Amino acid sequence: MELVVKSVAAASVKTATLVIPVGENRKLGAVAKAVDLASEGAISAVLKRGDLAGKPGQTLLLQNLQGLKAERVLLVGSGKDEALGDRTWRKLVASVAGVLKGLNGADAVLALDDVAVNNRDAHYGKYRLLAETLLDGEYVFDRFKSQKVEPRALKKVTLLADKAGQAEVERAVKHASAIATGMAFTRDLGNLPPNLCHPSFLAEQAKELGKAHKALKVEVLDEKKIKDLGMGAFYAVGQGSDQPPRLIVLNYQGGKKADKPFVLVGKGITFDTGGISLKPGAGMDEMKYDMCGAASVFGTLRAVLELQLPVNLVCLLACAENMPSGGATRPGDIVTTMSGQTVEILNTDAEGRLVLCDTLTYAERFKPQAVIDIATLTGACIVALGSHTTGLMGNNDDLVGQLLDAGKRADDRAWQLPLFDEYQEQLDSPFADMGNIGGPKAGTITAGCFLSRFAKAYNWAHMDIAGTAWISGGKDKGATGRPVPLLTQYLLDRAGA
Amino acid sequence: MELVVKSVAAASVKTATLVIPVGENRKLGAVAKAVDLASEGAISAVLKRGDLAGKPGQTLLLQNLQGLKAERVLLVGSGKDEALGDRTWRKLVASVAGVLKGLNGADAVLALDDVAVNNRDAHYGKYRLLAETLLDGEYVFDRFKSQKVEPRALKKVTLLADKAGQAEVERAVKHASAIATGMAFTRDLGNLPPNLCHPSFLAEQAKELGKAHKALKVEVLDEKKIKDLGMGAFYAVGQGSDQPPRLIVLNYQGGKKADKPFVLVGKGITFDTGGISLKPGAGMDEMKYDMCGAASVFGTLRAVLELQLPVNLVCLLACAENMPSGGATRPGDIVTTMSGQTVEILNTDAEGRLVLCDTLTYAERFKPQAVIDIATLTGACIVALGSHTTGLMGNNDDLVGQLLDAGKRADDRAWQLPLFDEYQEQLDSPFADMGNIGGPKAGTITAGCFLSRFAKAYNWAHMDIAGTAWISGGKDKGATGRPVPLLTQYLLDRAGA
Amino acid sequence: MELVVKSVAAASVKTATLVIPVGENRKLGAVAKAVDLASEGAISAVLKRGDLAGKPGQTLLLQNLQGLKAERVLLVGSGKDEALGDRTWRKLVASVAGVLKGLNGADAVLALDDVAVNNRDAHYGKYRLLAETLLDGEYVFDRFKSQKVEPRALKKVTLLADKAGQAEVERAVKHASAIATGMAFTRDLGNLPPNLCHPSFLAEQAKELGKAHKALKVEVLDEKKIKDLGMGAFYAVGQGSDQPPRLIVLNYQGGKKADKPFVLVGKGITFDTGGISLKPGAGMDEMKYDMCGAASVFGTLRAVLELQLPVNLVCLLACAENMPSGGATRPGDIVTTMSGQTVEILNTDAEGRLVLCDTLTYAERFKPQAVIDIATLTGACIVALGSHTTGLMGNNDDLVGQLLDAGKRADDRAWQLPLFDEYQEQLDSPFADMGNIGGPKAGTITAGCFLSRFAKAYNWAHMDIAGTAWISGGKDKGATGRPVPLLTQYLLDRAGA
């Protein structure tokens, strides 16, 4: 979809559908009032009949009105006078998009300048949310359908704002477009089934990306290299499968050569059966999303490439497929990690932290200013924070604060959990330097504690996206693309953009 | 056992054991009375003592009686002066057989003409049930025992009937003998353990059968052929095992060249672990019977060959072994079926419908007049219809009705369940054309619905024999041979025999 | 909502909203075409723009059109030019009703004569389904909401038909209105929470209904009466609770004095905890619907009273509340039923068949021509037939067939399951005449088998509505009102109405 910004009057714009807001009690703001006046009162005449109560997202669609250049006018409810919260604003926009998707109009004009959004400026923050919702809402994954989604008529949307706000709306659209393009890439990789989307496939995706971008260099480390580097934990996860593991490095040099890089580490478990500690059958298909950490790193990188941010960004994708077999890791195996710390693998279904720990040690070589790991790590995080909020831990309160602030401004929120030293003992092993599980109490936190033992060389944060990375059921089952908005926001903030 | 029919007087017949019926209140029918008189009232005299109440299947065994040529007389209770139901009649016969098997007599004569069986003619229907119970009751599967069953003395049974009915009893014996010989083959294949009875073994069985019979042509399609035909669902089931899959085609051309064939499709999962969606351990051994669909097709074919029915019969055995491994199918995999329809494999333990759907597409080439699939498909069918009655679904009312009627006449009953369109949606997938599971509601029906999407080219029915194909425990644990009687009866009906 | 029928031309009717169908490819039937012409081609002109593809239930709403007397015109998609199935037709009607409910129009005119419905005549069967969907869709249960549903503007719908069809449409409306009114009563009783809706409450409801209807006499039997009649199974169920049981008799004498009555027996377990055989907590709230058998009998009676059918109808509501306590029935208890047959209560959560068996014996006194029990009886029925189809068993083929045919014509379908004698032994007890459970195989059937032992005196059928009586979750959670349509249709059939 093409998304552009103009400052012309709403009544003057030639379009298939003009969209304007209407409050409860048929209350029209200055923009809608001017459109009503151009229609010689036709809009307020229809509103007087009472079909539209004006609750947020309710709609009334009109056809050709004399005095207007729009072929259709869509009235959308904006609710009571009170400013809208983020969720209500995004639902309003999605309601609009749903109607437009079903029409045979080639373009539409949104004239929603009068709608106030709580704690967001009328031009940048408000439109960041609208644009991302509109563009991400175009997403289709019909690759495996014999009957394809018939393409939609809607090819273009124009946002109307005042002259003074136009540049800021354009900046919101630029940023939202990069984020939505990155999210589409994330969502495609998440939604791909695990018989196709395995570690070698992700390596090929990375190599393709490297060829397409001059400032990107890609290196792929195979199973032998992982083993030779001393990555005993990463190797142990992957060995059970016929699909070998891959550590994928994507190095974007957008900053000055001397600038310390930001490192994103993504968990790329392409399918998590649990291994010998096998999962139950119910809902196991959703473990194709266990590479959503790696997918979100791909999508964040793709947003960064689109924006050409002037930062050095090193992406490390720790990819393996966790399968039961006659050569799989067993509960009770002890391995030596790249750091030299030994790990007793008490449960082979706590495998993400194993590929991550070795990759955290690998990251030391880049001499980073921040290392953020993203992983669908714990069912415990869904118990703690549910579907709405990513769990966040780290070893630097300034980094943790920056990620929280980015998630608030991006409306892709996270929430800090503590890594108090008292939780560490839960990982104690009588045999090895640590075990890989902490028991049934504080599961999200003990997984963060385990990772923290490998992150002492740098400023580090860990994002547990087990609850935010996909929707489990209903019509909308599938990858969400989170946390691409938070991560991209954090990088925009570090770039000063 | 040799089973013959004669029309001589019971008192006159030289035999190790003469069997005659006695009612309650010591009441003797015409046949029994004649034997009593020949015995000089000896039988009445013993009855007066009251040891035999005459309830169905009760017995009293006499030794040499003056005036008879029989060495022993077995009296068997026939109940009150009303006709017996099928179950009571078959139990009476089994009771008699159990006594004879324990004796050292080389033959026996059954003189049970006076016993009425409800809704069964005195010559054909009555003796179809008797002869099949007698012959199937001889079944022994002692090949894995170090101590073999002491072979039995009983080598021959003669059924006495009146002259007028002799040919119809002979026709019942001909048909029952073919059915029982088919059932023995089915039972042996089901009872064989899965380390021996794998898809390659079944292929060798088919090849051996092909060499033994001129009107039979056998082709075996291996794993690469299955893959190269585009059978993505069948291939997915078999990949996880070290034993590769086989699609076995047995083509019997007994009809006219231009007569459309009847196609039988059998599920041949030689062991069902569930795969990655692994089953619980308890009772898993009974999943060696997950090839009883394919076994019943082999047994029906053996009966048809014995009878030389004048029909074209194509048998398709879809054989694979469902194992967990590092190369097995995962929940969430999406495959392209031979038909081009895509399937999301949400649960790798819903595997029978996957090998079946591709085999249903394969069956289109034969331009059949009926396609019947037989499969141990759903635990839900045991919840719905239990151990007694096979679940039946289809896309043609006439075919379904023919199979029901065959089951009633063969005393191997089925019962229809509806494939209403409302159940289809339970198979919807957001990614593929369908998923392979429908959830906890209507599981037998949604499996039928899944298969129906591959059967639209022809008249089709599906038989879920999960409850009727074997007995789980007790002294009689093992394959039953069902539904060989129903299927054979259906083909006798189509042949006009 | 008032529902009336007229034979005036669609373009001529003064109304807030005129509803007409449009096919795919903008194809207009005779009625829609005549409206288009009166609108001076306005409707064709809007359709040419392509916003409405015409798939069943899609909508496009127009405002005031020159040449018409309708204030609004709703175009509704009717699909390709083939007849619609029942489900598609009812979903089309619900789509229309949804739009109308959100408008501020006091009335609407449905001009849907053009639309063909498969296997149902243009006037009676087609409009039975439309009228019931429209009227049942008006249902609101907001008693426990602090914020009430806003009263809807829509008060009247007019159906247009040709003069020749008017009588038959009016008959359909009369019957659908009775059915919908009965369903609303059923749904209210089902949706009441169990702290309010207990057996004494249902007894009050029945007494109040008796006072309002001349031809209705109501008797209520309390716990002591149930005990004193020798109803040891019914008494055993209710004894654990602080709410005592009630057996409610509602006798409608609408037939000739010497006509044998139809008896409906409803399970009225107002809450089923399982008792000492306690249920799991998950979903237990839905056991407030365990009196939906009884609720559907009240609803059917309400429909019969509205229609004044000329039949004698005796309703027996077997009401109890199944609770654990220090005085509750135990697994292993043996009780003497009213019939004198003893029952070993192996599981106290098989309680509905216990209150039903004693009520089936009580029904003998009426010398009925048919006895139908309706009960939310088995989870196994949901496994067998899911949410779409009621399970049906019986001891009379004619009665079973009549109920099946009623279900088809009412679009409230049932499906027969067999009560073969082989399933009876599953109920054997070493101690009593029978146990109340048959094990994990054929649960729906063994429950019907249990009941059949109490129904030998008369023609009897059993409806297991465990899957059809309510919706478990989502926006539409709550009672369905089924099987009031099937039961009312059966009584219409017996009355000759």
Ligand SMILES: CC(C)C[C@H](NC(=O)[C@@H](O)[C@H](N)Cc1ccccc1)C(=O)O
């Ligand atoms: C063994 C445990 C300590 C850890 C275990 N974690 C895992 O299995 C992770 O690898 C899972 N990928 C976490 C998960 C499970 C379900 C939904 C979303 C995310 C878990 O159950 O949380």
Ligand SMILES: CC(C)C[C@H](NC(=O)[C@@H](O)[C@H](N)Cc1ccccc1)C(=O)O
């Ligand atoms: C995963 C489910 C949708 C289907 C699943 N079906 C199976 O596993 C079939 O392959 C089984 N072969 C069915 C079965 C299980 C136990 C006894 C007899 C038959 C079942 O549990 O019924």
Ligand SMILES: CC(C)C[C@H](NC(=O)[C@@H](O)[C@H](N)Cc1ccccc1)C(=O)O
């Ligand atoms: C103990 C078993 C033989 C019978 C048991 N039946 C019951 O508990 C019935 O009283 C329940 N009212 C049946 C039920 C359970 C869940 C949803 C709908 C209907 C059941 O589990 O089906």
Ligand SMILES: [K+]
């Ligand atoms: K994936």
Ligand SMILES: [K+]
């Ligand atoms: K076997």
Ligand SMILES: [K+]
């Ligand atoms: K209730």
Ligand SMILES: [Mn+2]
């Ligand atoms: Mn895991």
Ligand SMILES: [Mn+2]
């Ligand atoms: Mn299986």
Ligand SMILES: [Mn+2]
């Ligand atoms: Mn219960």
Ligand SMILES: [Zn+2]
């Ligand atoms: Zn994982």
Ligand SMILES: [Zn+2]
């Ligand atoms: Zn199976």
Ligand SMILES: [Zn+2]
């Ligand atoms: Zn109950």
